[PDB]
């Protein structure tokens, strides 16, 4: 596995139906996107800010009629919209994606959206969720990460066993409850997590 | 007994009750300040408010008076630290999560029924940690709810009935419970292995009951 770095350039962006991004990073990613897929809606918010989506995932009654006379051709048809967006992009040979706007509204939607990341990667997709506060990266087995000393790192386990690290302030164990692995800290310019199985890393900006 | 779910939060309940939810104390955590009428109702009606670091800044700026401030005084605006220095408590030099320290402070005071507001909406790792901690607080013997801008999280053990309304969105997050089954929900339950699986179920009627052994979390959307 190649080292996970900050310089992430995805082939496509998914704009999910959580809170529209406010931080510079997700906003820049959206602005310089090669391909944008909008979930339900999010398309209305995206268009109102003077942007143009490539694909809209929803039921046809998603867009405002006012925008429909301009983007009815790019609307496309059960799971959640984020997952449908991932699967659509996967069907087009896209392998590298960032999701923005996936959090910050209903918390059950936030929880669902985050948990699905681990499932996308096992399918063979490279996906990251970029928020106003950090980046979620689904991982399996041994993985190295670029960091800076003092960078806050949270680890949430998804069934992985034998978790241990170098380059983090606190040692790891096979976490269960979500709080257990949160609010660790990088002590150097890189850290490596060793295990077998799936887990999720949140790197705070 | 039956947990009234969100039905004891609304100004006008479907449940033919003569009261509403008034916990013994409110914790204002350090996520986004409540914006929705329901967590704001709890805050407005509270006679004991514990502020986490910071969270006290917005509370004070809106003209309100914390009863206790948990954690680092340095997280306060200088004038606020000066105004409230005598109610700043560092309950532990080991525990670092202020939400947890607030719960522990209230428990030592002999308080058991509490609501947490402002726990979510900023850094998502704080959101995830704060939510998951509800299971620990319940285990410790506290009756605790987290009340957000969008619904309420209730930590649960074993069999539990909830008041509801037809079409209410109900999400179940598993924390090691086994034999999950329900009456009164649209979708049959399974022993959920990932968070999304039990989300966005739906109450059919005015009550539902979840049966199992072990711990889980229920989110009821307003």
Name the residue among B125, B150, B151 with its Cβ closest to that of A182. Answer: B125
d(CA A40, CA A49): 16
**Residue whose C-alpha is closest to residue B198's, from B185, B208, B184:** B185
Chain B positions touching A204 (Cβ under 8 A) are 123, 125
Chain B positions touching A202 (Cβ under 8 A) are 124-125, 128
A95 burial (CB, 10 Å; 0-12 / 13-18 / 19+) is middle
Contact B129 A204 (CB under 8 A): no
d(CA A36, CA A43): 10
Annotated domain spans of chain B: 1-222
What is the DSSP annotation of B20-34? Answer: ----SEEEE-SSSPP
Distance from CA of A75 to the nearest CA of B (A): 24
**Number of H-type helices and E-type strands within chain A:** 6, 13
Neighbours of B34 (CB within 10 A): 23
Phi, psi of A133 (to 5 degrees): -130, -15
**Residue whose C-alpha is closest to residue A40's, from A59, A22, A14:** A59
Contact A179 B150 (CB under 8 A): no
B22–chain A Cβ distance below 8 A for any pair: no
Note whether B76 and B181 are within 8 A (CB). no
- Which experimental technique did the depositors report for determining this structure? X-ray
Q: How big is chain B by its Cα radius of gyration, in Å?
A: 18
Q: Which residue of B has its CA nearest to A152?
A: B125
Q: What resolution, expressed in A, was reported for this entry?
A: 1.8
Distance from CA of A198 to the nearest CA of B (A): 12
* Rounded (10°) angle between helices B124-139 and A107-115: 110
Chain A positions touching B221 (Cβ under 8 A) are 106, 108
Q: Which CATH class is domain A1-205?
A: alpha beta
Q: Three-class SS of residue B143?
A: strand
B140–chain A Cβ distance below 8 A for any pair: no
Q: Which CATH superfamily includes the segment(s) B1-222?
A: Thiamin pyrophosphokinase, catalytic domain (3.40.50.10240)
Residues 6+ apart with CB under 8 A from A193: A139, A142, A143, A145, A155, A163, A164, A165, A172, A199, A201
Phi, psi of B140 (to 5 degrees): -75, -10
Please give the angle made by the CA atoms of B148, B150 and B152, to the nearest 5 degrees.
55
Total number of residues shown for chain B: 222
Name the residue among A114, A158, A177 with its Cβ closest to that of B135. Answer: A177
Chain B positions touching A158 (Cβ under 8 A) are 194
Q: Three-class SS of residue A87?
A: helix
């Amino acid at each position: 596995n190649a080292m996970i770095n900050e310089h992430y350039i995805p082939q496509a962006i998914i704009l999910a139906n959580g809170e529209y991004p406010a931080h510079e990073l997700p906003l820049r990613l959206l602005a310089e996107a090669q391909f944008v897929v909008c979930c339900n809606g999010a398309a209305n918010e995206y268009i109102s800010r003077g942007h143009t989506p490539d694909v809209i995932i929803g039921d046809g009654d998603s867009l405002l009629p006012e925008y429909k006379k301009r983007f009815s051709s790019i609307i496309l048809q059960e799971t959640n919209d984020q997952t449908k967006a991932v699967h659509y992009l996967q069907s087009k040979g896209i392998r590298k994606i960032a999701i923005v706007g996936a959090t910050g509204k209903r918390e059950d939607h936030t929880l669902g959206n985050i948990s699905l990341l681990v499932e996308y990667m096992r399918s063979g997709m490279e996906v990251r969720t970029v928020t106003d506060y950090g980046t979620f990266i689904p991982v399996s087995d041994t993985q190295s990460f670029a960091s800076y000393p003092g960078q806050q790192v949270s680890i949430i386990n998804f069934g992985a066993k034998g978790l241990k690290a170098e380059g983090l302030f606190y040692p790891l164990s096979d976490f269960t409850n979500w709080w257990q692995g949160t609010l660790n800290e990088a002590i150097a310019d890189e850290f490596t997590i060793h295990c077998t199985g799936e887990y999720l890393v949140f790197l705070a900006y």
